[PDB]
Amino acid sequence: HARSTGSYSLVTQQPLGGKAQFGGQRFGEMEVWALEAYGAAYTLQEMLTVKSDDVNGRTKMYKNIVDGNHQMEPGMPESFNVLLKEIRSLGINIELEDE
């Protein structure tokens, strides 16, 4: 199996196979610990941000990919954002501060 950029999931924006075009491989907690141990920071960021969960990140990446510029403008993963809304839906006020 293989995939570059496929269809995604509605609830949480995440890679999902629609066409039997197999959704991306799962990157688990251990698989994260490996990158931690190595100390590859950007590999990790892009792994859980721009290559997966970041709704803007994915496309803003792809554009730079074809343009020959290898970079990332990561932003915030939709998982955490969804969690912000879910928590703040309760009587809990959770804000992002400073600058």
Partner: protein, 89 residues
């Protein structure tokens, strides 16, 4: 294909700063800012940057000096333009 970055880790230590700096340079090329310091063997900007580290002609110090110089390279041309903005008084 640079098989071992050992000779590169030698020049600039810590081996993380290596990846960081060599990245900075590799983009100083891939984004068209400049051209290689050594024959490109078809090596991509990654390996070109690495080779540049091995030869000891590229590091944090060198890059910073180069860039800070370029800031003035632009200040020189803009010397007349930005000074003509005195209308702010």
């Amino acid at each position: 294909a640079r098989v071992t970055v050992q000779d590169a880790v030698e020049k600039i230590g810590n081996r993380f700063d290596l990846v960081l700096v060599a990245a900075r340079r590799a983009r100083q090329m891939q984004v068209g800012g400049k051209d290689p310091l050594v024959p490109e063997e078809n090596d991509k900007t990654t390996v070109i940057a690495l080779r540049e580290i091995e030869e000891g002609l590229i590091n944090n110090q060198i890059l910073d000096v180069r860039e800070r110089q370029e800031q003035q390279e632009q200040e020189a041309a803009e010397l007349q333009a930005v000074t003509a903005i005195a209308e702010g008084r």
